[PDB]
Design a protein around this ligand. Structure first.
Ligand code: HEM
Ligand code: AD8
Length: 214
């Protein structure tokens, strides 16, 4: 529809369905993730969020992004650093995997942030609004699958401490997406970039599934 938030949701419905059908996601939802698989996911998220959040910081003052700049509410890099120190130990930064599908996603994030920051909102939407949607249900499926020690670390990623109500925040973020001023041409490019963002996630999950069969 007219609102960017509605147009994004409509335009990405098909690719979101593709994501729901992905082998890795079917497995994840059914509690079939192993510690190895979960670690790969966390490492992937770290690389992705490092790049996204670097680009957000670069562009935070620009009219094409400032309205959707919510650093305290949304930032995930620090939580992922905490979790990776648990999952991979003190040398995590040296030992975490960085695979081609992770690299392709990072590469696109930097291209967008450096050369077409007007499309960064498509990437922030796809990452943050999705990741905020797996409330306690996704954390618990993982928690049951992983059988973690009682050491109070490893799942920080699944809690956004600065957002009390996901619905409340999501409605605000949608409004801010809708506040963005763009030409019809740019709006179309933003929609296409959200599809690209979903496709980069789908390709990532396909690669991770392939790595886990070896
Ligand atoms: C396990 C597979 C998945 C399931 C079962 C699932 C399910 C859902 C559900 C039920 C919502 C609620 C929509 C809302 O009210 O906001 C949602 C939102 C969302 N999902 Fe997923 N999802 C999956 C994978 C993905 C993936 C891989 C992405 C890519 C980043 C993604 C991106 C999003 C986004 C951006 C939203 C917010 C939509 C909006 O409100 O505009 N999802 N998802
Ligand atoms: O499905 C999600 C987030 N999510 C929830 C609803 N739509 C997207 C992920 C986010 C993040 C942690 C786990 C595995 C993978 C990467 C996908 C659940």
């Amino acid at each position: 529809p007219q609102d960017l938030s509605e147009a994004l949701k409509e335009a990405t419905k098909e690719v979101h369905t593709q994501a729901e059908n992905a082998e890795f996601m079917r497995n994840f939802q059914k509690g079939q993730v192993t510690r190895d698989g979960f670690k790969l996911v966390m490492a992937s998220l770290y690389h992705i969020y490092v790049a996204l959040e670097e680009e957000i910081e670069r562009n935070k003052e620009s009219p094409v992004f400032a309205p959707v700049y919510f650093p305290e509410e949304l930032h995930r890099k620090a939580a992922l650093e905490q979790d990776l120190a648990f999952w991979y130990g003190p040398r995590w930064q040296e030992v975490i995997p960085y695979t081609p599908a992770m690299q392709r996603y990072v590469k696109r994030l930097h291209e967008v942030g450096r050369t077409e920051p007007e499309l960064l909102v498509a990437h922030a939407y796809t990452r943050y609004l999705g990741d905020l949607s797996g409330g306690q249900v996704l954390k618990k499926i993982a928690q049951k699958a992983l059988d973690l020690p009682s050491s109070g670390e490893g799942l920080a990623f699944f809690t956004f401490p600065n957002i009390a109500s996901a619905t409340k925040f999501k409605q605000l973020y949608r409004s801010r997406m809708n506040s963005l001023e763009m030409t019809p041409a740019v709006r179309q490019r933003v929609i296409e970039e959200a599809k690209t963002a979903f496709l980069l996630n789908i390709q990532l999950f396909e690669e991770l599934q392939e790595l886990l069969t070896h």
